[PDB]
Symmetry: C2
Subunit: 91 residues, 2 copies
């Protein structure tokens, strides 16, 4: 019975705090990578596709390849732009 809307939405909220915090940490790592490389462009397509491949093989209730592809397309965009901007300003 604790599945009322209030409670499910608090659970979403806890998810979103963690998801946000993890995304923040993923940008800090991407910052470190940008700095040790400083490539003209940051785009490493082989690596992106390796990430997706590996994650696709894992066991999920609801995620599949379409959902991961959409999710990570945005994640990789966010990460790429962030690294670019970091390199523009620190130079």
């Amino acid at each position: 019975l604790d599945s009322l809307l209030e409670n499910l939405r608090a659970e979403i909220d806890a998810l979103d705090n963690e998801l946000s915090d993890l995304l923040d940490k993923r940008l800090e790592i991407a910052l470190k990578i940008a700095l040790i490389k400083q490539e003209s462009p940051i785009y490493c397509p082989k690596r992106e596709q390796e990430i997706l491949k590996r994650l696709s093989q894992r066991d999920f209730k609801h995620l599949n390849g379409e959902i991961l592809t959409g999710f990570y397309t945005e994640v990789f965009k966010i990460s790429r732009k962030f690294q670019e901007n970091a390199l523009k300003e620190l130079k």
Copy 2:
């Protein structure tokens, strides 16, 4: 490189968790779809409330632009998923 290999191992650990968290967030949205079958999926007030709330938190790098991008896609994923899950009921 060497440093590079380690940073990428960390990304990998991160991405395992980020995926696991997204899968759990789909499960909860599934529960929500099911307790709310007589109503629209798109709740723009709630989406805005989520972003506002998350914008208030302390981040090293995230800002409003980055969260908006991220969650636009998260909400799209969540919306489509709920639709399709409800299509599998009678």
